[PDB]
A paper describes a structure:
However, because of the intrinsic flexibility and irregularity of loop regions, organizing multiple structured loops at protein functional sites has been very difficult to achieve by de novo protein design. Experimental characterization shows that the designs are monodisperse, highly soluble, folded and thermally stable.
The in silico validated designs span a diverse range of shapes with different repeat protein curvatures and loop geometries and adopt multiple loop buttressing strategies using loop–helix hydrogen bond networks and loop–loop bidentate hydrogen bonds. Key to this success was the design of dense networks of hydrogen bonding and nonpolar interactions within and between the loops and between the loops and the underlying secondary structural elements.
Author numbering: 1 to 205
Amino acid sequence: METPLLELIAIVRQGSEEQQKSALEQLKRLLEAGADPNAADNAGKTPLLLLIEIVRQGSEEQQKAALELLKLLLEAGADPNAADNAGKTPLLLLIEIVRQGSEEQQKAALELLKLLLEAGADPNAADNAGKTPLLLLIEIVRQGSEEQQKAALELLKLLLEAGADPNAADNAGQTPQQLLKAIERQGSEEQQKAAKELLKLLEEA
């Protein structure tokens, strides 16, 4: 399962700044010439997932290079829903970046998540514990910084307008409405006013 796309993404991940730039230009030319955007490495990691790992771990230059390449992969037809072997999906992984990333990483991930949803990512596809994107993003409202709270608010609205199940519960029974009311009880005045707006948005959906 070795291809030019995967070898070159490896150079974006590990090469010098000059090597990264040349690898990005070679990747675009391969994609433009029809290289398969879906052919995965020996671990079931897709080009999309591998470049999202670069957004999660890379320098500010690497995050920009990977954001550019991720947009081109999605325009090339990369499957926005394909998971790796451990069950990680691009939507879930990008939500992890919102939860743990720097302010620069959060912005990249917010831009990518919108592109992912426009490409057909499943807004209902959950992780192992059964947490939906909806639940995971409400957890960021609860525990994030003010800037994470704001991005999560934006993503939640875009996720409901993309058809997310307002009532879908996780494996333990937890619901978005349950979590939002806990934020209403325990959160800051800013969080309480956000959780109230989100409860009305949940019902309306």
